[PDB]
Every structure is written in C-alpha cells, then in structure tokens.
Amino acid sequence: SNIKVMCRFRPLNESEVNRGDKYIAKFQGEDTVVIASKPYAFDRVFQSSTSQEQVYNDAAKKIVKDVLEGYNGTIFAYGQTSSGKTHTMEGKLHDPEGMGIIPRIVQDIFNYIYSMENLEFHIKVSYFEIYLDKIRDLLDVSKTNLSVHEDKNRVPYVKGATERFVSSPDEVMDTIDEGKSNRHVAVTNMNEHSSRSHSIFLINVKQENTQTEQKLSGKLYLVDLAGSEKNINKSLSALGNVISALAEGSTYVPYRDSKMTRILQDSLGGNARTTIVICCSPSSYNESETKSTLLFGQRAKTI
Ligand SMILES: [Sr+2]
C-alpha cells in the first residue's frame, strides 16, 4: 500500500434519463467529488467524459512499467452493477479508441518487449472466475472448483489452473475472447451471472538477461469484481478488510478471509502496486449505492 484509489463517473445512460434522474455529482479540483454536500477525496477523480486513454494513463500505465521491473501488481474495478466496471476494464476489446485497461496493458507490454536484445521474455496468462467463493477456469470448463495452495517459497497459486504461453497481443486477446465464450457454459443468463461473479485475468512476465543471467518475474492481476450493490459479497468484504488492514499499517493482513484475497496475496499490499478504480453512476437514483462505493474507496486512506 502502494494502494491508489481512483473514482470514475460515467455519463447518465438513456434509462436514467428516461426515468427523470438528475446528475448529482459535483467536482472540485482533480481529486474530489461532492455528493450531498460531503467531499470525498481520492488519488484521482475522472469525470463523466474521461476517455479510455486518460484512465489507462493514470490508473495502469505506471503499474505496467513496474511489472516489467519485476514487481507484482493488481488493478481492480469496483462498483455497483452497470456503473461501468466492464467498460473500464475491457471496453471494446479490439477498438483502438474504445478499448479498456486490459487490452491497453497487453499492447504496452509487448511494445516494451519489442523495444528491448540480450533480454529473453516468457509471458504466461491465466483466466478464471470466482462465483460463490468457487474458482472456475475460464480456459478449461472441466475445472470448476479449483483450490488455492501455497508453494515452498510461500507464493500462492491456483492448483491446476490453465496457463497459456503467449507471444503476441493478438494471442492474448484471442485468449480473452475464448474465456468470455467459455464463461457462458452451464450459465443460464450471462448478464446476471457476470454481475454476480468476479473475473480475474493474470499476466505473468518473466525475463532473463542472457549476458548477466539476472532473472526477473512479475505478475499482474486484472480484476473485474462482482457488483457491490441481503449480504455483502464474501470476496468484497474480504477485500475491504485487507485494504483497511494495509491502510493502517497492520503487520497482519487477513488475506485468508477469501480465496480471492489468498490468490492475490503476493500482488496486493506490501511491495506490490495496486490501483482500485471505483466506478459510479452520477444518477440521483443511485445516490446511496454511490455513497457506499465512495466509502469503500476511502478504506485505502492511510492512517
Ligand atoms: Sr464471492
């Protein structure tokens, strides 16, 4: 921590306008939003017309550089259903202007790599979903209840999760498209299922300098969380407890409160780099969920 929080408001959608909703967010400077006369400050606040490129530049581009220096990292999208999480994390996957964080990260990683001579790179990706605290491999639909374990050096791993070596951004994008298709298997209503489950995309960048033999490894987890809007989702409550513990400098961090936070243990907090993008509707209709989303983001404020 090493945890940054950035708030992204989207425009009102046509359904909110058809209902007669009002735009209730006000902005001060670049880092504060006011709701019902209360200010909420973050590392950055994105207004409703912020482009995909600006969001990537502020939220993710530095973390990509760090992963290529051998750090681990995580980027989360958090917020109520329809607040813009998937538009932020994925966008229009193949459109140069509309693409989201994930395809831009893939582009930058490979462009950086192409720009290196004595360095040798190995890139691996995995893609899974957490639904009801159960891990399902999006690259192998026969693997639906995977367990979390620790290795001998104590690094977490998902036992038996598919790993795919990739050598081009199009290979990565093809892998994401395959996972999105496989996600439909044994699922009645995809849209509802997606809003109630977490998708986790892992990119593992390993490198060795062949003339000095130094090796570096970095893992970047990209997480599109379930809707935060009767219980709080178990992964989300675990995530809040972990962020709050890190924010107060606690020696003990309760990663074991969920499978998701156990998986991310070496890529969330400590020496790892993290950005949480909280996504919000500006609608008067969603005011109390927006308040709750902003309060979740303030968990990261260091005390
Ligand atoms: Sr869950």
mmCIF file of C-alpha atoms and ligand atoms in Angstrom:
data_model
loop_
_atom_site.group_PDB
_atom_site.id
_atom_site.type_symbol
_atom_site.label_atom_id
_atom_site.label_comp_id
_atom_site.label_asym_id
_atom_site.label_seq_id
_atom_site.Cartn_x
_atom_site.Cartn_y
_atom_site.Cartn_z
ATOM 1 C CA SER A 1 0.000 0.000 0.000
ATOM 2 C CA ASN A 2 1.154 1.320 -2.536
ATOM 3 C CA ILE A 3 -2.655 1.315 -2.955
ATOM 4 C CA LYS A 4 -4.131 4.115 -5.043
ATOM 5 C CA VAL A 5 -7.860 4.676 -5.471
ATOM 6 C CA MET A 6 -9.323 6.464 -8.473
ATOM 7 C CA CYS A 7 -13.003 7.254 -8.945
ATOM 8 C CA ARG A 8 -14.550 7.132 -12.437
ATOM 9 C CA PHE A 9 -18.002 8.621 -13.024
ATOM 10 C CA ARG A 10 -19.821 7.653 -16.226
ATOM 11 C CA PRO A 11 -22.473 9.718 -18.072
ATOM 12 C CA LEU A 12 -26.130 9.253 -17.279
ATOM 13 C CA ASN A 13 -27.474 6.489 -19.506
ATOM 14 C CA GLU A 14 -30.693 6.716 -21.502
ATOM 15 C CA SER A 15 -32.645 4.627 -18.947
ATOM 16 C CA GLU A 16 -31.662 7.020 -16.153
ATOM 17 C CA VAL A 17 -32.656 9.989 -18.321
ATOM 18 C CA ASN A 18 -35.921 8.296 -19.294
ATOM 19 C CA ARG A 19 -36.703 7.832 -15.594
ATOM 20 C CA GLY A 20 -36.063 11.524 -14.939
ATOM 21 C CA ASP A 21 -32.907 11.086 -12.841
ATOM 22 C CA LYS A 22 -30.768 14.105 -12.001
ATOM 23 C CA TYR A 23 -26.982 14.461 -12.215
ATOM 24 C CA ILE A 24 -25.926 14.783 -8.563
ATOM 25 C CA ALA A 25 -22.109 14.673 -8.589
ATOM 26 C CA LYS A 26 -20.055 17.876 -8.312
ATOM 27 C CA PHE A 27 -16.316 18.038 -8.829
ATOM 28 C CA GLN A 28 -13.610 20.108 -7.124
ATOM 29 C CA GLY A 29 -10.054 20.038 -8.434
ATOM 30 C CA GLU A 30 -8.864 16.748 -9.930
ATOM 31 C CA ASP A 31 -9.225 14.530 -6.858
ATOM 32 C CA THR A 32 -12.509 15.349 -5.081
ATOM 33 C CA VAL A 33 -16.191 14.611 -5.730
ATOM 34 C CA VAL A 34 -19.029 16.140 -3.690
ATOM 35 C CA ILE A 35 -22.226 14.170 -3.013
ATOM 36 C CA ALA A 36 -24.964 15.640 -0.784
ATOM 37 C CA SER A 37 -22.506 18.362 0.342
ATOM 38 C CA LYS A 38 -19.883 15.861 1.542
ATOM 39 C CA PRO A 39 -16.434 15.876 -0.092
ATOM 40 C CA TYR A 40 -14.700 12.608 -0.962
ATOM 41 C CA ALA A 41 -11.010 12.792 -1.901
ATOM 42 C CA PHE A 42 -9.081 10.177 -3.877
ATOM 43 C CA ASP A 43 -5.828 9.913 -5.781
ATOM 44 C CA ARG A 44 -7.744 10.937 -8.923
ATOM 45 C CA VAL A 45 -11.372 11.562 -9.896
ATOM 46 C CA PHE A 46 -12.438 11.041 -13.516
ATOM 47 C CA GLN A 47 -15.453 12.990 -14.737
ATOM 48 C CA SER A 48 -18.138 11.542 -16.993
ATOM 49 C CA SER A 49 -16.458 12.232 -20.374
ATOM 50 C CA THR A 50 -12.952 10.988 -19.443
ATOM 51 C CA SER A 51 -11.510 8.949 -22.309
ATOM 52 C CA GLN A 52 -10.311 5.356 -22.039
ATOM 53 C CA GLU A 53 -6.760 6.516 -22.744
ATOM 54 C CA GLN A 54 -6.716 9.019 -19.865
ATOM 55 C CA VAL A 55 -7.989 6.358 -17.451
ATOM 56 C CA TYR A 56 -5.303 3.874 -18.552
ATOM 57 C CA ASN A 57 -2.556 6.522 -18.374
ATOM 58 C CA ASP A 58 -3.405 7.465 -14.770
ATOM 59 C CA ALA A 59 -4.588 4.149 -13.361
ATOM 60 C CA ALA A 60 -2.439 1.479 -15.032
ATOM 61 C CA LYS A 61 0.494 2.600 -17.192
ATOM 62 C CA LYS A 62 2.913 3.009 -14.276
ATOM 63 C CA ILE A 63 1.981 -0.409 -12.855
ATOM 64 C CA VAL A 64 2.820 -1.983 -16.236
ATOM 65 C CA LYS A 65 6.287 -0.428 -16.088
ATOM 66 C CA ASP A 66 6.726 -1.815 -12.576
ATOM 67 C CA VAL A 67 5.679 -5.325 -13.604
ATOM 68 C CA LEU A 68 8.412 -5.135 -16.261
ATOM 69 C CA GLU A 69 10.839 -4.190 -13.470
ATOM 70 C CA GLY A 70 9.864 -7.344 -11.576
ATOM 71 C CA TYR A 71 7.064 -6.098 -9.325
ATOM 72 C CA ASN A 72 3.687 -7.719 -8.848
ATOM 73 C CA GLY A 73 0.511 -5.705 -9.143
ATOM 74 C CA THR A 74 -3.269 -5.691 -9.146
ATOM 75 C CA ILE A 75 -5.864 -3.463 -10.774
ATOM 76 C CA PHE A 76 -9.473 -3.747 -9.582
ATOM 77 C CA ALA A 77 -12.702 -2.321 -10.910
ATOM 78 C CA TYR A 78 -15.269 -1.939 -8.117
ATOM 79 C CA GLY A 79 -18.794 -0.568 -8.067
ATOM 80 C CA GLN A 80 -22.447 -1.294 -8.484
ATOM 81 C CA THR A 81 -23.746 -3.229 -11.479
ATOM 82 C CA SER A 82 -23.961 -1.002 -14.601
ATOM 83 C CA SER A 83 -21.583 1.577 -13.095
ATOM 84 C CA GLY A 84 -19.008 0.983 -15.846
ATOM 85 C CA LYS A 85 -16.605 -1.717 -14.475
ATOM 86 C CA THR A 86 -16.519 -3.835 -17.645
ATOM 87 C CA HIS A 87 -16.361 -0.759 -19.892
ATOM 88 C CA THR A 88 -13.358 0.385 -17.811
ATOM 89 C CA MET A 89 -11.517 -2.952 -17.648
ATOM 90 C CA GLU A 90 -12.344 -4.310 -21.129
ATOM 91 C CA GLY A 91 -14.152 -1.704 -23.224
ATOM 92 C CA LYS A 92 -14.460 -2.510 -26.919
ATOM 93 C CA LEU A 93 -11.682 -5.083 -26.870
ATOM 94 C CA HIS A 94 -10.430 -4.504 -30.442
ATOM 95 C CA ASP A 95 -11.208 -0.808 -30.970
ATOM 96 C CA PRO A 96 -8.142 1.484 -30.689
ATOM 97 C CA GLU A 97 -10.201 4.305 -29.145
ATOM 98 C CA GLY A 98 -12.758 2.350 -27.150
ATOM 99 C CA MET A 99 -10.569 -0.391 -25.695
ATOM 100 C CA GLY A 100 -10.237 -0.533 -21.909
ATOM 101 C CA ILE A 101 -7.418 -1.096 -19.449
ATOM 102 C CA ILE A 102 -6.742 -4.764 -20.185
ATOM 103 C CA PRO A 103 -6.116 -4.530 -23.962
ATOM 104 C CA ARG A 104 -4.020 -1.378 -23.464
ATOM 105 C CA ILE A 105 -1.844 -3.184 -20.907
ATOM 106 C CA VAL A 106 -1.346 -6.056 -23.343
ATOM 107 C CA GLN A 107 -0.354 -3.605 -26.080
ATOM 108 C CA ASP A 108 2.164 -1.778 -23.877
ATOM 109 C CA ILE A 109 3.771 -4.946 -22.506
ATOM 110 C CA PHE A 110 4.556 -6.275 -25.958
ATOM 111 C CA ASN A 111 5.598 -2.909 -27.415
ATOM 112 C CA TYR A 112 8.025 -2.512 -24.497
ATOM 113 C CA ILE A 113 9.360 -6.017 -25.118
ATOM 114 C CA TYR A 114 9.862 -5.375 -28.835
ATOM 115 C CA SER A 115 11.885 -2.275 -27.814
ATOM 116 C CA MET A 116 14.461 -4.266 -25.816
ATOM 117 C CA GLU A 117 18.488 -7.524 -27.309
ATOM 118 C CA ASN A 118 20.156 -9.536 -24.552
ATOM 119 C CA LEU A 119 16.788 -9.952 -22.783
ATOM 120 C CA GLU A 120 14.646 -13.085 -23.123
ATOM 121 C CA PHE A 121 10.936 -12.922 -22.266
ATOM 122 C CA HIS A 122 8.340 -15.550 -21.368
ATOM 123 C CA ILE A 123 4.706 -14.459 -20.988
ATOM 124 C CA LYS A 124 2.023 -16.683 -19.421
ATOM 125 C CA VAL A 125 -1.666 -15.886 -18.926
ATOM 126 C CA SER A 126 -4.452 -17.477 -16.888
ATOM 127 C CA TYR A 127 -8.125 -16.514 -16.758
ATOM 128 C CA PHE A 128 -10.625 -17.588 -14.123
ATOM 129 C CA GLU A 129 -13.852 -16.631 -12.426
ATOM 130 C CA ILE A 130 -14.894 -16.673 -8.790
ATOM 131 C CA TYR A 131 -18.577 -17.347 -8.168
ATOM 132 C CA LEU A 132 -19.843 -18.185 -4.670
ATOM 133 C CA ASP A 133 -16.256 -18.496 -3.394
ATOM 134 C CA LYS A 134 -15.622 -21.220 -6.018
ATOM 135 C CA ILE A 135 -12.867 -20.862 -8.653
ATOM 136 C CA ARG A 136 -13.683 -21.839 -12.245
ATOM 137 C CA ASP A 137 -11.081 -21.926 -15.034
ATOM 138 C CA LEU A 138 -12.312 -19.842 -17.999
ATOM 139 C CA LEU A 139 -9.822 -21.672 -20.233
ATOM 140 C CA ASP A 140 -10.993 -25.189 -19.223
ATOM 141 C CA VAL A 141 -14.656 -25.583 -18.304
ATOM 142 C CA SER A 142 -13.979 -29.006 -16.808
ATOM 143 C CA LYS A 143 -12.114 -27.278 -13.917
ATOM 144 C CA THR A 144 -14.848 -25.715 -11.818
ATOM 145 C CA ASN A 145 -13.829 -25.879 -8.139
ATOM 146 C CA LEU A 146 -10.099 -25.237 -8.011
ATOM 147 C CA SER A 147 -8.243 -24.934 -4.713
ATOM 148 C CA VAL A 148 -5.694 -22.357 -3.533
ATOM 149 C CA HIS A 149 -2.345 -23.561 -2.182
ATOM 150 C CA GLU A 150 0.982 -22.101 -1.282
ATOM 151 C CA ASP A 151 4.238 -23.232 -2.631
ATOM 152 C CA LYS A 152 7.533 -23.876 -0.840
ATOM 153 C CA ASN A 153 8.586 -20.229 -1.063
ATOM 154 C CA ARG A 154 5.039 -19.461 0.086
ATOM 155 C CA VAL A 155 3.749 -17.898 -3.127
ATOM 156 C CA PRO A 156 0.099 -18.572 -3.727
ATOM 157 C CA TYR A 157 -1.164 -20.495 -6.712
ATOM 158 C CA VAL A 158 -4.412 -21.952 -8.046
ATOM 159 C CA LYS A 159 -3.791 -25.690 -8.295
ATOM 160 C CA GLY A 160 -4.387 -26.912 -11.842
ATOM 161 C CA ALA A 161 -5.397 -23.577 -13.368
ATOM 162 C CA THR A 162 -4.677 -23.392 -17.096
ATOM 163 C CA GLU A 163 -1.582 -21.381 -18.054
ATOM 164 C CA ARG A 164 -1.066 -20.398 -21.694
ATOM 165 C CA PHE A 165 2.231 -19.129 -23.084
ATOM 166 C CA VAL A 166 1.567 -16.172 -25.366
ATOM 167 C CA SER A 167 3.859 -14.404 -27.819
ATOM 168 C CA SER A 168 1.723 -11.591 -29.272
ATOM 169 C CA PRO A 169 -1.066 -9.224 -28.218
ATOM 170 C CA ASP A 170 -3.452 -10.952 -30.626
ATOM 171 C CA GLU A 171 -2.702 -14.249 -28.899
ATOM 172 C CA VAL A 172 -3.627 -12.656 -25.564
ATOM 173 C CA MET A 173 -6.793 -11.117 -26.999
ATOM 174 C CA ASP A 174 -7.785 -14.470 -28.537
ATOM 175 C CA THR A 175 -7.333 -15.971 -25.056
ATOM 176 C CA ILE A 176 -9.630 -13.349 -23.513
ATOM 177 C CA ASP A 177 -12.249 -13.988 -26.219
ATOM 178 C CA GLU A 178 -12.073 -17.716 -25.524
ATOM 179 C CA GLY A 179 -12.578 -17.182 -21.783
ATOM 180 C CA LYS A 180 -15.558 -14.886 -22.394
ATOM 181 C CA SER A 181 -17.145 -17.540 -24.591
ATOM 182 C CA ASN A 182 -16.357 -20.371 -22.150
ATOM 183 C CA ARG A 183 -17.834 -18.272 -19.340
ATOM 184 C CA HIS A 184 -21.296 -18.925 -20.885
ATOM 185 C CA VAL A 185 -21.045 -22.707 -20.341
ATOM 186 C CA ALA A 186 -23.545 -24.051 -17.766
ATOM 187 C CA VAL A 187 -24.797 -20.471 -17.265
ATOM 188 C CA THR A 188 -28.440 -19.569 -17.953
ATOM 189 C CA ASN A 189 -28.320 -15.753 -18.035
ATOM 190 C CA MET A 190 -24.838 -14.463 -18.794
ATOM 191 C CA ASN A 191 -25.504 -10.825 -17.910
ATOM 192 C CA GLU A 192 -26.863 -11.556 -14.423
ATOM 193 C CA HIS A 193 -24.129 -14.144 -13.812
ATOM 194 C CA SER A 194 -21.423 -11.649 -14.810
ATOM 195 C CA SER A 195 -22.779 -9.030 -12.409
ATOM 196 C CA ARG A 196 -22.639 -11.524 -9.522
ATOM 197 C CA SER A 197 -19.195 -13.034 -10.183
ATOM 198 C CA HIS A 198 -15.574 -11.879 -10.328
ATOM 199 C CA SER A 199 -13.338 -12.287 -13.379
ATOM 200 C CA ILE A 200 -9.565 -12.435 -12.829
ATOM 201 C CA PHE A 201 -7.036 -12.178 -15.674
ATOM 202 C CA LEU A 202 -3.383 -12.933 -14.895
ATOM 203 C CA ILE A 203 -0.374 -11.907 -16.995
ATOM 204 C CA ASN A 204 2.958 -13.303 -15.782
ATOM 205 C CA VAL A 205 6.030 -11.619 -17.325
ATOM 206 C CA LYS A 206 9.352 -13.419 -16.838
ATOM 207 C CA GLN A 207 12.686 -12.213 -18.215
ATOM 208 C CA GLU A 208 16.349 -13.151 -18.107
ATOM 209 C CA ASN A 209 19.353 -11.149 -19.318
ATOM 210 C CA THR A 210 21.357 -13.782 -21.201
ATOM 211 C CA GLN A 211 24.634 -11.891 -20.654
ATOM 212 C CA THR A 212 24.257 -11.318 -16.894
ATOM 213 C CA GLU A 213 21.834 -14.206 -16.114
ATOM 214 C CA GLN A 214 19.773 -11.997 -13.811
ATOM 215 C CA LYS A 215 16.122 -13.031 -13.793
ATOM 216 C CA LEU A 216 13.000 -11.027 -13.025
ATOM 217 C CA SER A 217 9.380 -12.091 -12.724
ATOM 218 C CA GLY A 218 6.233 -10.037 -12.351
ATOM 219 C CA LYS A 219 2.564 -10.931 -12.100
ATOM 220 C CA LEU A 220 -0.231 -8.518 -12.969
ATOM 221 C CA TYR A 221 -3.771 -9.419 -11.900
ATOM 222 C CA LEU A 222 -6.636 -7.554 -13.611
ATOM 223 C CA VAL A 223 -9.871 -7.998 -11.693
ATOM 224 C CA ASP A 224 -13.420 -7.104 -12.767
ATOM 225 C CA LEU A 225 -15.308 -7.551 -9.475
ATOM 226 C CA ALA A 226 -18.904 -8.559 -8.819
ATOM 227 C CA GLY A 227 -21.418 -5.760 -8.332
ATOM 228 C CA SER A 228 -21.181 -4.170 -4.897
ATOM 229 C CA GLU A 229 -24.909 -3.435 -4.525
ATOM 230 C CA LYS A 230 -29.063 -9.222 1.577
ATOM 231 C CA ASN A 231 -25.345 -9.695 2.293
ATOM 232 C CA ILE A 232 -22.169 -8.048 1.115
ATOM 233 C CA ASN A 233 -20.382 -10.381 -1.280
ATOM 234 C CA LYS A 234 -17.796 -12.504 0.546
ATOM 235 C CA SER A 235 -14.874 -11.571 -1.723
ATOM 236 C CA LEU A 236 -15.768 -7.890 -1.396
ATOM 237 C CA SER A 237 -15.905 -7.984 2.401
ATOM 238 C CA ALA A 238 -12.546 -9.789 2.457
ATOM 239 C CA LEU A 239 -11.113 -7.177 0.085
ATOM 240 C CA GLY A 240 -12.329 -4.334 2.308
ATOM 241 C CA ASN A 241 -10.760 -5.957 5.371
ATOM 242 C CA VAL A 242 -7.444 -6.441 3.557
ATOM 243 C CA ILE A 243 -7.323 -2.854 2.241
ATOM 244 C CA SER A 244 -8.266 -1.442 5.650
ATOM 245 C CA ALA A 245 -5.580 -3.538 7.363
ATOM 246 C CA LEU A 246 -2.916 -2.375 4.895
ATOM 247 C CA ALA A 247 -4.075 1.247 5.223
ATOM 248 C CA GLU A 248 -3.480 1.204 8.967
ATOM 249 C CA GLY A 249 -0.059 -0.401 8.578
ATOM 250 C CA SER A 250 -1.064 -3.639 10.289
ATOM 251 C CA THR A 251 1.586 -6.333 10.408
ATOM 252 C CA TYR A 252 -1.146 -8.960 9.988
ATOM 253 C CA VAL A 253 -3.269 -8.735 6.831
ATOM 254 C CA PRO A 254 -6.284 -11.106 6.604
ATOM 255 C CA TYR A 255 -5.725 -12.443 3.086
ATOM 256 C CA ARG A 256 -7.217 -15.757 4.208
ATOM 257 C CA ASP A 257 -10.711 -14.183 4.541
ATOM 258 C CA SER A 258 -11.417 -15.357 0.943
ATOM 259 C CA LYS A 259 -9.998 -17.373 -1.929
ATOM 260 C CA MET A 260 -9.684 -14.201 -4.000
ATOM 261 C CA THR A 261 -7.540 -12.398 -1.437
ATOM 262 C CA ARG A 262 -5.430 -15.553 -0.892
ATOM 263 C CA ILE A 263 -4.708 -15.753 -4.640
ATOM 264 C CA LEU A 264 -3.735 -12.047 -4.768
ATOM 265 C CA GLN A 265 -1.719 -12.127 -1.518
ATOM 266 C CA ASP A 266 1.678 -11.546 -3.178
ATOM 267 C CA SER A 267 0.248 -8.962 -5.607
ATOM 268 C CA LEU A 268 -1.795 -6.806 -3.219
ATOM 269 C CA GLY A 269 -0.169 -4.730 -0.496
ATOM 270 C CA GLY A 270 3.419 -4.763 0.669
ATOM 271 C CA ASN A 271 5.840 -4.267 -2.222
ATOM 272 C CA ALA A 272 3.125 -4.889 -4.818
ATOM 273 C CA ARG A 273 1.458 -1.986 -6.658
ATOM 274 C CA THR A 274 -2.329 -1.626 -6.654
ATOM 275 C CA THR A 275 -4.929 0.672 -8.186
ATOM 276 C CA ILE A 276 -8.610 0.344 -7.374
ATOM 277 C CA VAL A 277 -10.824 2.080 -9.916
ATOM 278 C CA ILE A 278 -14.188 2.583 -8.213
ATOM 279 C CA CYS A 279 -16.948 3.127 -10.789
ATOM 280 C CA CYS A 280 -20.051 5.240 -10.089
ATOM 281 C CA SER A 281 -23.271 6.315 -11.754
ATOM 282 C CA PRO A 282 -23.930 10.052 -11.271
ATOM 283 C CA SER A 283 -27.685 9.418 -11.008
ATOM 284 C CA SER A 284 -29.826 10.749 -8.162
ATOM 285 C CA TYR A 285 -31.484 7.317 -8.238
ATOM 286 C CA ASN A 286 -28.234 5.588 -7.204
ATOM 287 C CA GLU A 287 -27.127 8.113 -4.571
ATOM 288 C CA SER A 288 -26.923 5.684 -1.648
ATOM 289 C CA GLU A 289 -25.069 2.979 -3.590
ATOM 290 C CA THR A 290 -22.680 5.660 -4.883
ATOM 291 C CA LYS A 291 -22.113 6.752 -1.278
ATOM 292 C CA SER A 292 -21.310 3.152 -0.334
ATOM 293 C CA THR A 293 -18.927 2.826 -3.266
ATOM 294 C CA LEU A 294 -17.108 6.024 -2.277
ATOM 295 C CA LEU A 295 -16.872 4.806 1.349
ATOM 296 C CA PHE A 296 -15.311 1.540 0.152
ATOM 297 C CA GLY A 297 -12.673 3.538 -1.731
ATOM 298 C CA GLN A 298 -11.859 5.605 1.327
ATOM 299 C CA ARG A 299 -10.766 2.381 3.089
ATOM 300 C CA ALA A 300 -7.364 2.857 1.447
ATOM 301 C CA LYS A 301 -6.693 6.219 3.145
ATOM 302 C CA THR A 302 -3.511 5.644 5.151
ATOM 303 C CA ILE A 303 -3.935 6.251 8.887
HETATM 304 SR SR SR B 1 -17.895 -14.450 -3.747
#
